[PDB]
């Protein structure tokens, strides 16, 4: 009990320093400039030295028989640590690398070849082509031009990135830098509920087998209906071209709904047309997300949030990171970097990013060292639970995006969700599995892009329109890789997403298909989540899960029950198409 005194001075300094470092990072994303690079470096160095200091000191106070478990947990947390991890050169090299990879990704220009001084950025320009353009010549130009003029310059940086990130993990007693990320799910010392760093992989590969029947039929359907949009460009057997999948990385098949509508004469379930018709501003999207959490039983957003956050693009002169970002700066300051588009895409992303904050606001009741969320997938699942509910045809009617009103409609909606959700399950499995095999030293630099196209064709079912030399770095052309971030969260997320929704649909008293369920004007479901939302790291994710759902592990069963009507339907419609894919088709 004697060291509860120490933790107060830790929390006092940690909150000043954590906020100091976190705000300097916010300044940078909002205003990319040397004003904020050097501030983000310095505040990061000081915050990091404090952590290695305070962990050294916590290790001077061993833990046993402390009854006020608040102290036991804050100590166990300090015990997880960074210890003498890097020399000044290697800290400053990784700083320079990630102050460059994040800059190149967010500022990277692509010159239009017919005028060498005319340029276009990813946000929103090049992604406008990849998302909405239906011109193969043009979609192909945007797709590679990014990976060539930007993705090539990112390779030797990620190359050094891999070297030094992997040395870090071993210094803190890890297997590899992928193991460092995989350790987020570890539950250790608990008798009835535990989880190893390696069990993450066993569970991912195991449950991923139950996706393939649903994904392969979705693949074949998208193939057959892309062929009606890109006539002579797509094989009826092979893998889909990457640049035709709705975005620059082939991640979300959401934008293919425009081309894959199961029942086109139904009133449009994608309400982007209505949101533009009603002249929705960026705030109205978030206002109409704030209201949903209120109907759950949750508080309004803070006045700091509404006058700090950058929810739109700045002027073109002001260079900025625009990927949806939710911040807990500590000390009560909550911010979001949406750079919102008037669309159902960012509409349902608003509920996602706002779900991050509501989770942050909830577990702010716990001490500093517990304010992280149960694990990666939990911090993401909170947002998806809400957007899944906000997106139902019923809920969209009530909002005012659909005018007053079917088996055909239910499929018409359910495909759109599978395009967004299911399309990213194999993309996510592919991405981190590649990164882990690089971190584990299994894929040499001789075979980086080799193994990347290998896995694109075999696992995802997607091909390169032009075979790429090792010069390219295709994974780093994505935000989550370029800006150091983990991706396996999105696989675990989706399985968590439907476990929780099944439990909440009992609390909200649904009596029906999970497909049609939303959480609105239901204190029962809000109280149910909020009981868990406050916990943070106070409980292992294994129990935070079991205290809401009946399961003590990531589980794929309720995911499939959300989509079972679409699966039965896709089996019917794909008798006229090949279902699998050829490992070796190449439009080249």
């Amino acid at each position, epitope marked *: 009990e*004697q*060291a509860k*005194t*120490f933790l107060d*001075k830790f929390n006092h300094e940690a909150e000043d320093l954590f906020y100091q470092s976190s705000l300097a990072s916010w300044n940078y994303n909002t205003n990319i400039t040397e004003e904020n690079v050097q501030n983000m470096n310095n505040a990061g160095d000081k915050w990091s030295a404090f952590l290695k200091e305070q962990s050294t000191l916590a290790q001077m106070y061993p833990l046993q028989e402390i009854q006020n478990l608040t102290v036991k947990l804050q100590l166990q947390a300090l015990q997880q640590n960074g210890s003498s991890v890097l020399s000044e050169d290697k800290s400053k090299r990784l700083n320079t690398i990630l102050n460059t990879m994040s800059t190149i990704y967010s500022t990277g220009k692509v010159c239009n070849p017919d005028n060498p001084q005319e340029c276009l950025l990813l946000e929103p320009g090049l992604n406008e082509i990849m998302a909405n353009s239906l011109d193969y010549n043009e979609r192909l130009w945007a797709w590679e031009s990014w990976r060539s003029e930007v993705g090539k310059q990112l390779r030797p940086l990620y190359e050094e990135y891999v070297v030094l990130k992997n040395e870090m993990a071993r210094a803190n007693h890890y297997e590899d830098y992928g193991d460092y990320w995989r350790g987020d799910y570890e539950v250790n010392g608990v008798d009835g509920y535990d989880y190893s760093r390696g069990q993450l992989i066993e569970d991912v590969e195991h449950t991923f087998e139950e996706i393939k029947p649903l994904y392969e039929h979705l693949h074949a359907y998208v193939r057959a209906k892309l062929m009606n949009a890109y006539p002579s460009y797509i094989s009826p057997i092979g893998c889909l071209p990457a640049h035709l999948l709705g975005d620059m990385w082939g991640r979300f098949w959401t934008n293919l709904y425009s081309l894959t509508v199961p029942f086109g004469q139904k009133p449009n379930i994608d309400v982007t047309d209505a949101m533009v018709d009603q002249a929705w501003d960026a705030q109205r999207i978030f206002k109409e997300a704030e209201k949903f959490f209120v109907s759950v039983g949750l508080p309004n957003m803070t006045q700091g949030f509404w006058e700090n956050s950058m929810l739109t693009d700045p002027g073109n002169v002001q260079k900025a990171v625009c990927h949806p970002t939710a911040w807990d700066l500590g000390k009560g300051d909550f911010r979001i970097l949406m750079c919102t588009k008037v669309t159902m895409d960012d509409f349902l992303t608003a509920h996602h990013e706002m779900g991050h904050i509501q989770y942050d606001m909830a577990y702010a009741a716990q001490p500093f060292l517990l304010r992280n969320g149960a694990n990666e997938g939990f911090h993401e699942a909170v947002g998806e639970i809400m957007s899944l509910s906000a997106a139902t045809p019923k809920h969209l009617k009530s909002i005012g995006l659909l005018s007053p009103d079917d088996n055909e409609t239910e499929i018409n909606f359910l495909l759109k969700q599978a395009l967004t959700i299911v399309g990213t399950l194999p993309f996510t499995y592919m991405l981190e599995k590649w990164r882990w095999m690089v971190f584990k030293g299994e894929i040499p630099k001789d075979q980086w892009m080799k193994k990347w196209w290998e896995m694109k064709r075999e696992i995802v079912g997607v091909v390169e329109p032009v075979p790429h030399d090792e010069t390219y770095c295709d994974p780093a052309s994505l935000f989550h890789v370029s800006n150091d971030y983990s991706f396996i969260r999105y696989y675990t997320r989706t399985l968590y997403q439907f476990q929780f929704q099944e439990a909440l649909c009992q609390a909200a008293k649904h009596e029906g298909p999970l497909h049609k369920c939303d959480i609105s004007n239901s204190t029962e479901a809000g109280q149910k989540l909020f009981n868990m939302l406050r916990l943070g790291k106070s409980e292992p994710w294994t129990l935070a899960l079991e205290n809401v759902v009946g399961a003590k592990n990531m589980n794929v069963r309720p995911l499939l029950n959300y989509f079972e009507p679409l699966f039965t339907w896709l089996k019917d419609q794909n008798k006229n198409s090949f279902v699998g894919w050829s490992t070796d088709w190449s439009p080249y």
Partner: antibody
Amino acid sequence: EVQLVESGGGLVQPGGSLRLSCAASGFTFIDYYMNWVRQAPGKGLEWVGFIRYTTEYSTSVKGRFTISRDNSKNTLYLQMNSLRAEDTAVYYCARHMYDFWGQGTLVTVSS
Amino acid sequence: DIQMTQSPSSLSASVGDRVTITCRASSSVRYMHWYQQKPGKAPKLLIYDTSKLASGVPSRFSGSGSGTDYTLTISSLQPEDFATYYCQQWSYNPLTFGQGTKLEIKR
């Protein structure tokens, strides 16, 4: 400077009462433990009590003494409700932590 | 409760000699804390934590210890080191001192 200044009464009748006090400066008051010690002229040092804001006493004095803080005046108090001639000693205030001493005040209890 | 007692309950020593005072605790092996009390004045902390000199204490002083046996030593005893020396627990719910050691200087 780190400074503890002590004051209080001297001679008090047995069975009576007396309150001691110490002021502190040069540092944050509430960041430290405040303690009273006690040295009868012919004895070593005793612990009298402790205040975090928990309050604990040695067995000899808990039934007779009370320790109090005013953390805005930056002061420590010792109130001796029932005094024995046994309690005659020089009383010191001290700053302890996860040291500095004021100079002791002689409380003498005899009739 | 926890108690302790010093082995030389009293000690006479000559100027400039290599001297040692020893305290034996009852039940524990913890970071021990030493004090030097000049008579008629408040006790002054000598060794903040075993083998760490308190601020203001000169290089002549040194502390050490392990087990229940913690010691204090002076390289070259100066005439100005006349005092009674005490040890403080810092370890458990009942704070305590032990039998003090008085040092007298030979001449």
